[PDB]
TrEMBL record, chain A:
<comment type="function">
    <text>ATP-dependent DNA 3'-5' helicase required for initiation of viral DNA replication. It forms a complex with the viral E2 protein. The E1-E2 complex binds to the replication origin which contains binding sites for both proteins. During the initial step, a dimer of E1 interacts with a dimer of protein E2 leading to a complex that binds the viral origin of replication with high specificity. Then, a second dimer of E1 displaces the E2 dimer in an ATP-dependent manner to form the E1 tetramer.</text>
</comment>
<feature type="region of interest" description="DNA-binding region">
    <location>
        <begin position="4"/>
        <end position="148"/>
    </location>
</feature>
<protein>
    <recommendedName>
        <fullName>Replication protein E1</fullName>
    </recommendedName>
</protein>
<comment type="function">
    <text>ATP-dependent DNA helicase required for initiation of viral DNA replication. It forms a complex with the viral E2 protein. The E1-E2 complex binds to the replication origin which contains binding sites for both proteins.</text>
</comment>
<comment type="subunit">
    <text>Can form hexamers. Interacts with E2 protein; this interaction increases E1 DNA binding specificity. Interacts with host DNA polymerase subunit POLA2. Interacts with host single stranded DNA-binding protein RPA1. Interacts with host TOP1; this interaction stimulates the enzymatic activity of TOP1.</text>
</comment>
<comment type="similarity">
    <text>Belongs to the papillomaviridae E1 protein family.</text>
</comment>
DNA sequence: CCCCCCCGTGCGCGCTGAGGTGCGGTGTGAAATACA
DNA sequence: TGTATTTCACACCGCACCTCAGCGCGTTTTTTTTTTTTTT
């Protein structure tokens, strides 16, 4: 359980300088499946962040990961494109176990696939040397910065 | 669109500070993996001309960026560029090894850096194998100044390097070098403008930048160089130095110089004017 | 019918390392038989410009590629290119014929390659026709360096051949050459940057690369070179390496040096343990 | 269960030709106005 | 009911606009040259 709180949203914004709501759309039912997911994790240890990159690569067509911590705390973000569609219930169980964290430490919603600022978010992230990357960029992001 | 855009290439080349053509071409062809303008450039049948223009523009931007900084900003940038582990102790220990106070060296360094006339040349006089060139080469490496060579003084273009760098070094000045300074280049030690050529260029008249010389000859003792006693500050190096297992008992790093300048930003009296923008977005308006 | 595309032509040129312009022009005009782009080149109305631009682009690529290789990687790339079959036994037996243990030459190479100051020059001293130039020039040829020439020291333009290469040989340094080293290149043997000068150009300030010098004068016995004692490691080549009875028994082809390096990668304190996927990515630079 | 920042702009002078689109020089009459 | 007297109405045929990018597109003396001073 534990979708999110004013405190988790507040920390995300203080670190990434934009609202978690501006890069995701809403799935109110924990059973609806989808290949693409946006994940935010608070209080995650570095060794598990790095291990998750190698493990997710084997079941994904695309993956982009980054992290940002400060005085408040640490919180990473993942754009995950699974080879097979999964529900929030399933992804929640997979990632809490994989990252060695309580479910309350996570926030999960599918991506906002229409909107230039939302696409720019991922585009700008791909320009940092620290960002971990795997696979070909999703068409909605690519076509979000093209159009002649 | 896929049309190539030269401004982006110039911005990128300036971004990592690639100036020479070969590095620009190689690194850009490598970057062509994830740069739409790059994958456009590879197909543009006029690659060589674009590379030449990009290198020339980066050279222009960098050269006109360096010359636009007053001295304290230049030393600040050089301190920003210096990394390592060290301290000023690894210098003052050497000076005490040669039995000279550091306070006198600071009272000289302040004037030398300010370029004040008649006090704009430090001469380090010491017998061979006492460590002169070690300290001088370390200091001129930190100040990012060029080193001259009295070998070519038959060919008068050996001063060509004096047109850019802000701290010239002349190591192991013989009798001929001191006579040359006494007769011809008195103006530079004064500080009045001089004329200097540059291979295939015109004699660009500029003020003479500060110097730093090492010579066995004691100018302030001879009588032929009576007219240099009022243009040279000397420091005596007497105690011995490197003869031990290929490791000079003293080697001066860049961290030493960094902690030296930073710790003595008050005694050398280096500062800037009314400031309201120091740690901000660098003006990268070259795109 | 088939538009020209300079990119694939520069890719083809870099494929075969055809740096010079004339070879480009001739080989590509020959290849026009079975390469549509080459027929487009032949029908093109500005052929010479394309040849010149291709030559320039290939030169840029190759020069930058050479400059960017770290020293162990460059030794691997010079080990690949040396052709022939032989053995390090020639080096070992040459040395043991000069009564010099190999371990001495190793413990000198270990430093001389690392560029450690004050141990960055290896002098081979012995009366002539003793095998100095044999080993010294074979080793410089292996390292892809440039053989210098002490003769032109009347001009200061004889150091220009050190702006690029990573190993220099100064052959038969007489007293004049030793004095010149002691006076003007005091810095170079100390590893710190020097100021070389070329003809009709401007001086550049680069690090002094390693060196190999051959001389008949024992500098570590002279006194005016008291400074030179601390930055030159002497090697006494005394015995006659050349013909004992008419035919030189000893010669070091590139295979001998290559096998020497391959078997002595450990004791030199280098690293070529890449073995990444199969050999290397080496994808493309079109 | 709703807002604490992504975002620094436009191109070889010069052509010039097929392309088609339209209100008119001219396409020039059956309908349409009025005559007797 | 027969007939002089006229613009709208679909259009011959167009004068002439704007629209692209494949064709043209570049510097090299002076210094260094070994020459004879330039202490000796």
């Amino acid at each position: 359980g534990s979708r999110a709180t004013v405190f988790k949203l507040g920390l995300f914004k203080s670190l990434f300088l934009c609202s978690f709501h501006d890069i995701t759309r809403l799935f109110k039912n924990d059973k609806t499946t989808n290949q693409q997911w946006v994940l935010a994790v608070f209080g995650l240890a570095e060794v598990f962040f790095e291990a998750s990159f190698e493990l997710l690569k084997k079941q994904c067509s695309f993956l982009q990961m980054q992290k940002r911590s400060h005085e408040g705390g640490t919180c990473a973000v993942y754009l995950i494109c699974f080879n097979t569609a999964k529900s929030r219930e399933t992804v929640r169980n997979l990632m809490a176990n994989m990252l060695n964290v309580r479910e309350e430490c996570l926030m999960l919603q599918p991506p906002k696939i229409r909107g230039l600022s939302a696409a720019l978010f991922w585009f700008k992230s791909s320009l940092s040397p620290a960002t971990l990357k795997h696979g070909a960029l999703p068409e909605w992001i690519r076509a979000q910065t093209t159009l002649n | 669109t896929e049309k190539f855009d030269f401004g982006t290439m110039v911005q990128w080349a300036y971004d990592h500070k690639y100036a020479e053509e070969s590095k620009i071409a190689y690194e850009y062809a490598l970057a062509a993996g994830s740069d739409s303008n790059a994958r456009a450039f590879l197909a543009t049948n006029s690659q060589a001309k674009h590379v030449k223009d990009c290198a020339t523009m980066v050279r222009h931007y960098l050269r006109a960026e360096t010359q636009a900084l007053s001295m304290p900003a230049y030393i600040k940038a050089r301190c920003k560029l210096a990394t390592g582990e060290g301290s000023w102790k690894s210098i003052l220990t050497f000076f005490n090894y040669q039995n000279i106070e550091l306070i006198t060296f600071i009272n000289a360094l302040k004037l030398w850096l300010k370029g004040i006339p008649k006090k704009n040349c430090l001469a380090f006089i010491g017998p061979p194998n006492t460590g002169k060139s070690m300290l001088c080469n370390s200091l001129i490496h930190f100040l990012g100044g060029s080193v001259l060579s009295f070998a070519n003084h038959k060919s008068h273009f050996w001063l060509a390097s004096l047109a850019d760098t802000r701290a010239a070094l002349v190591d192991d000045a013989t009798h001929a070098c001191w006579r040359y300074f006494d007769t011809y280049l008195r103006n530079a030690l004064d500080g009045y403008p001089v004329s200097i050529d540059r291979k295939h260029k015109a004699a660009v008249q500029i003020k003479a930048p500060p110097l730093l010389v090492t010579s066995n000859i004691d100018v302030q003792a001879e009588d032929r160089y009576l007219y240099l006693h009022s243009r040279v500050q000397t420091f005596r190096f007497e105690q011995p130095c490197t003869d031990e297992s290929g490791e000079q008992p003293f080697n001066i790093t860049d961290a030493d110089w960094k902690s030296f300048f930073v710790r003595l930003w008050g005694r050398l009296d280096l500062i800037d004017e009314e400031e309201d923008s120091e740690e901000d977005g660098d003006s990268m308006r070259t795109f």
